[PDB]
Amino acid sequence: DKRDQILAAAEQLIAESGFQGLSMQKLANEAGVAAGTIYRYFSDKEHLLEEVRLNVAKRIASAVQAGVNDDMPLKERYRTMWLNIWNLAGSNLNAISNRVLPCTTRNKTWELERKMFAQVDRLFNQGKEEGVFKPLDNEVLSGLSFEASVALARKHALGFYQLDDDALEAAIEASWDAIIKH
Amino acid sequence: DKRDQILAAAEQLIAESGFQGLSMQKLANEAGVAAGTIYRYFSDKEHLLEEVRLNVAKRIASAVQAGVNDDMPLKERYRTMWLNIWNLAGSNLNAISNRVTRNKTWELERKMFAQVDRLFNQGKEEGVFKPLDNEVLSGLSFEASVALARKHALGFYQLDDDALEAAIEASWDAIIKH
Ligand SMILES: [Cl-]
Numbered sequence: 001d002k003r004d005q006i007l008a009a010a011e012q013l014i015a016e017s018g019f020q021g022l023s024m025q026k027l028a029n030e031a032g033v034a035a036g037t038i039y040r041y042f043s044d045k046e047h048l049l050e051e052v053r054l055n056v057a058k059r060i061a062s063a064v065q066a067g068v069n070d071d072m073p074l075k076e077r078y079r080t081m082w083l084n085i086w087n088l089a090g091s092n093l094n095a096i097s098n099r100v101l102p103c104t105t106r107n108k109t110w111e112l113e114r115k116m117f118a119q120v121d122r123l124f125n126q127g128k129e130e131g132v133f134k135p136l137d138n139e140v141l142s143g144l145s146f147e148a149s150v151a152l153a154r155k156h157a158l159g160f161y162q163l164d165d166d167a168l169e170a171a172i173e174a175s176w177d178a179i180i181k182h
Numbered sequence: 183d184k185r186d187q188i189l190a191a192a193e194q195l196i197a198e199s200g201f202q203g204l205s206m207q208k209l210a211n212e213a214g215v216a217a218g219t220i221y222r223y224f225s226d227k228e229h230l231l232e233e234v235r236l237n238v239a240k241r242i243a244s245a246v247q248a249g250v251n252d253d254m255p256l257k258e259r260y261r262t263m264w265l266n267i268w269n270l271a272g273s274n275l276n277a278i279s280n281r282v283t284r285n286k287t288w289e290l291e292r293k294m295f296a297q298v299d300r301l302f303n304q305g306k307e308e309g310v311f312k313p314l315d316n317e318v319l320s321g322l323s324f325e326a327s328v329a330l331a332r333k334h335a336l337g338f339y340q341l342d343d344d345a346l347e348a349a350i351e352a353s354w355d356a357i358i359k360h
Contacts, residue, residue: 017202099200103337110338136348139339143330144352151325152318161317174312174322178356 003041006031007055010048015095019049053109056096061116063088064146068119074132075176077123078145082172085146089153120146124179133179144178185223188213192234197277201231232287238279243294245270250297256310257354259301260323264350267327272335298324302357311357322356 009031013022024045028035042048064084068077088094101109124141127133133141152171156163163171191213195204206227210217224230250262270276292299302319305311311319330349333339341349 018200020199021202106336107338110336134348134352136345136352137339137341139333140330140341140345140349140352143333144326144349144356147329148322148326148353148356151328152321155317155321161315163318167314167318170312170314171318171322174314174318174356177358177360178322178326178352180355182355182360 002033002037006033006038006041007052010052011056011092011096014052015092018099050105053100054112056093057113058116060093060097063093065119070122074123074127078176079172081120082146082149085150086153089157134181141179145175149175188220188223189233189237192230193278196281200281235282235287236290238282239291240294241275242279247297252297252300256301256305260354261350264324264327267324268331271331312359319357323353326353
C-alpha cells in the first residue's frame with residue numbers, strides 16, 4: 001500500500017511550492033511510483049488535495065497532543081500542548097496548513113479536523129467544569145491561548161524576537177491568564 | 183498609474199498564487215503590458231516585491247490603527263485596534279498580506295506601527311502591562327483577534343456580540359498584570 005508514501009511526497013511538494021503547483025507527474029517521480037499507481041489510490045488531483053489536508057490535520061493533532069495524559073493536572077496538560085505547538089514551528093505541517101475550496105468541502109474538512117483534537121476539548125471542558133476557565137466556547141478559548149501562540153512560534157522561527165526560557169515560561173503563563181477566570 | 187497598475191496586478195497575482203505564481207511573464211500578462219515595461223518601472227522582481235511588501239504593510243498599518251487617538255485611554259486604543267484587526271479578516275488586503283526581506287524593509291515597516299508600540303510601551307511604563315517584549319505582548323493579544331477573526335470570516339465559527347466582548351476582555355487579561 002503506497003498511499004502514505006504518495007501522501008508524504010505530496011505533502012513535501014505542497015510544503016515546498018504549494019497546492020496549485022502540484023503536478024501528478026512530479027508527484028509520481030518524487031513518490032517513486034508510476035503515474036498509474038497514483039490513480040489506484042486517488043481519483044484526481046482535487047481528491048488528493050483533500051486527503052492531504054486531512055492527513056496534515058491528523059498529524060498536527062497528534063503532534064499537539066503528544067505526551068498528554070488526562071491524569072496530569074490541567075495546567076501541565078496545557079503547558080505540554082503549548083510547548084508541542086511551539087516546537088512545530090518551522091515544520092512542513094505548519095508550512096502546508098498555513099495555506100489550505102468550496103464550503104461543501106470547506107465545512108466537511110473543518111468538521112472532520114475538529115474531531116481530531118479530543119484532548120484539547122477535554123482540557124477546556126474539564127477546566128470549565130472545574131470553574132478554572134472562563135465560560136467561553138472551546139473555539140474561543142483555543143483562539144485566545146494555543147492558536148495565538150502559533151503566532152509567537154511563527155514570528156520566533158522567522159527571527160522577529162529571541163525568547164529565553166524565563167521569557168517562554170512568561171509567555172505560557174500570560175496565555176493561561178487569557179483563559180482562566182480572575 | 184501605469185506603475186500603480188503593475189503594482190495592483192502584482193498584488194492580485196500574489197493573492198491568487200503567492201510569490202511562487204509571481205513570474206514576470208504572468209505579471210506582464212495580468213497587467214496587459216510587455217515584460218520590458220515592468221523592468222522599466224521597477225528594476226527587477228526583487229524591487230517590485232519590496233514595493234509590494236511596503237505597500238501592503240502600509241495599508242495593513244493604516245487599517246490596524248484607524249480611529250486610534252494617542253490621547254485616549256489605554257484600553258480604548260486597545261479595543262479599537264483589536265476590532266480593526268477583527269474587521270480585516272476575509273479582506274482582499276488580508277489575503278495579500280497573509281501571502282507576504284531586508285533589515286531596511288523591516289525597519290521601515292516597524293515605523294508604520296508606531297502607535298501599537300506606544301500602546302505597549304505606555305502600558306508597561308504605567309505598570310499596567312506585563313514587562314514583556316512588544317512582539318510578545320502583541321503575539322499574546324492582537325494575534326488572538328487574528329485567529330478568531332479568521333475562523334469567523336471562513337464561516338467556521340460564529341461569535342455573538344457578548345462573546346466578542348468577552349474575547350476582547352480575555353485577551354486583555356493575557357497582557358495585563360494580575
Ligand atoms: Cl499499488
